[PDB]
Every structure is written in C-alpha cells, then in structure tokens.
Design a protein around this ligand. Structure first.
Ligand SMILES: O=C(O)CNC(=O)C(=O)O
Ligand SMILES: [Mg+2]
Ligand code: NI
Ligand SMILES: [Zn+2]
Length: 331
C-alpha cells in the first residue's frame, strides 16, 4: 500500500505532465497521495495563471464576513457577521491596517503559535465564497474555470443526465481569517490555487481516520452534536493541533504559498488560517473514485448548512433514501 503513514505529498509535474488534469490526479492517487487527505502541487516553472494581478482592485466583495469566535483558545466555534460591501482595493487596505495586519514574527512556526494563542480575541474579516475566476481564459492547463464538471462526471459514470453547474469561487483573506473543520459537500474533492499574497496554513485528517475526528468533535461540542447528526457540515468548529494531539487524532499540517495548488481528497477533513492579505480560488471536482464516497456522505438535515442548487441532484441520484428529509432541511 502506497503512503501508509498518510503523509502529505508534494508533487512537481513537468509542463508535459501538466496537460491532462484527470490523468495527473490519477497518478497522484497511484502514489498514495489521497491517503493523507491533502496534497500540494507546485506548477511547472513555465506556467502562469495569468500575466499580472495589477488590475483586481475593483472586484466587489458584496458581503464581507467578520469571523467572531466563542469558546477557548484551542476549542472554539466561529460565526459570521455580515458587513457592508467593499472592493478588493478597500479590503486590501483594511487587511494592512494596524488593527488587522500580520504581527511581527520569526517564521511560520512562530506565526502558528501566535494564531492558536490569540485567534479567539480578534474578529478578522473574510471575503469568502465569491463566484468568479482570476485565471486568464488563455491559460489552458489547470485552469479552475475550465475543469470538467461534476455533473458530466456523474453522467459519464452513472449514465444519468442531471441539472446543475459547477463554477469556481474566490476567497480574499487577511491575518487570522479561518476555515473551520470540514469535508467538502457530498465529500467531493476540492482544488485550491493561491493566486497572490501571504500564505495559508492547512491541517488535515486522513480519510481513513475521519470518524475519529467526528467522535472528538461530538465530545467537544456536545450541544451542537445533539442539534444535528452532521454538525461539522455547518463549518463553524475549530480544534487546535495541541488538542488533536492530546486526544490522539491523527493529522498533518502544511503551509501553502502563492503560486501553489492544494488538492483535498474525498472525506479528507481540513481546517486552516491565512497569514495575511491573500486571494485564493477554489472549486469542487469529482473522479470515478469519488462516486462511492458521494453515496455515503453524511448530510446536515437540521437545516443550518444550506447548500448550492447543484447539490440537490447529487443527493437525489446518489442518496435517494436521504433525499426527502434532506430537502426538508433545504426548504
Ligand atoms: O481557502 C479557504 O478559506 C477554504 N478552502 C477550502 O476549504 C478548500 O479549498 O477546500
Ligand atoms: Mg478590478
Ligand atoms: Ni474545503
Ligand atoms: Zn445541521
């Protein structure tokens, strides 16, 4: 069995190997990459996502989210408070202000220490989930706006045509902006490109150990657990690496830098934080190996998690028994 300790693997494809996305994901998996739940892909040196980032300041962040924490330093939830619209130019200025900027630090490790010590005492503002793309239409390789769709994958594997579309999302981040512990909708893969700015640190639990995280989460967030049988779908819970180590939860960590891709694999729980002003683009995708995860994915039916139009059809075709109750949660 390849990669039995489930370590995060880092890949360095040649420009030739960068041509066929599906084939390269399949190569990574042949080397055991999926066992970690997360892989890093450094693009060939010849490749670029676009020519420059000099003209992005007029993109609108219609609903910036202030991320307010409750709990203790290592075990907390976060809620999102909606703020007034601002442009990317305005957001970058705010990220760089004395109130919100990255503190002085020695190295990534010192910054990580400062994150876990101090995150809960601040409420950073995140421009998340903004439909759109920063890839130039002439970038032909690993263009997250030109991938094969999840609906076409299901049609190719299963023979059923379904409604829905699949488009990318932009994330504009600042120091301490946080992504809570989650897997993707319907336990899909995701791919994330860090277009510009400061790094993003990731933590991940191997898929084969996901249930261990869920059991710890039920213990640490006991009211949430009673309210919903899949409350991690709400994407609000944070658990520090110190707490995971104290509870024997297997995980790994890695820092992504500008110009690098990260791929999350089906049922790979992940969480993390941004180091400073940055912009990432991400999208879900599927492969034939996903189908069996999709069929078994937990769902939120308390109604909090409220998800895309396109997820309907996945639940309807792959999880027909769940379908009824789940759409009651959606309506
Ligand atoms: O970048 C972020 O805030 C969150 N991204 C993801 O969880 C992902 O790409 O799967
Ligand atoms: Mg612009
Ligand atoms: Ni994710
Ligand atoms: Zn729920």
């Amino acid at each position: 069995a390849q990669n039995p300790n489930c370590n995060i693997m880092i890949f360095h494809p040649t420009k030739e190997e960068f041509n066929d996305f599906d084939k390269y994901i399949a190569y990574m998996e042949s080397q055991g990459a999926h066992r970690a739940g997360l892989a890093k892909i450094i693009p060939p040196k010849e490749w670029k996502a676009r020519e420059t980032y000099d003209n992005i300041s007029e993109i609108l962040i219609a609903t910036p989210l202030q991320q307010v924490a409750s709990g203790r330093a290592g075990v907390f939830t976060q809620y999102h408070k909606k703020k007034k619209a601002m442009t990317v130019g305005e957001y970058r200025h705010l990220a760089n202000s004395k109130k919100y900027q990255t503190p002085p630090h020695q190295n990534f490790e010192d910054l990580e220490r400062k994150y876990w010590k101090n995150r809960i005492y601040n409420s950073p503002i995140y421009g998340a989930d903004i439909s759109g793309s920063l890839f130039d239409e002439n970038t032909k390789q690993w263009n997250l706006g030109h991938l094969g769709t999840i609906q076409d994958l299901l049609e190719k594997e299963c023979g059923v045509v379904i409604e829905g579309v699949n488009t990318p999302y932009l994330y504009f981040g600042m120091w301490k902006t946080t992504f809570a512990w989650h897997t993707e909708d319907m336990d899909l893969y995701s791919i994330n490109y860090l277009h510009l700015g400061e790094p993003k640190t990731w933590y991940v639990v191997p898929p084969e150990h996901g249930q261990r995280l869920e059991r710890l989460a039920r213990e640490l967030f006991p009211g949430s657990s009673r309210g919903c049988g899949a409350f991690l779908r709400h994407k609000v819970a944070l658990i520090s690496p110190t707490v995971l180590k104290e509870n024997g939860i297997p995980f790994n960590r890695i820092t992504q830098e500008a110009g690098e891709f990260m791929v999350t694999f089906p049922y790979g729980y992940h969480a993390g934080f941004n180091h400073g002003f940055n912009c990432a683009e991400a999208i879900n995708f599927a492969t034939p190996r996903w189908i069996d995860y999709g069929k078994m994915a937990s769902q939120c039916s308390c109604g909090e998690a409220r998800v895309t139009f396109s997820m309907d059809a996945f639940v309807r075709i792959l999880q027909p028994e769940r379908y009824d109750l789940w759409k009651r949660g959606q309506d």
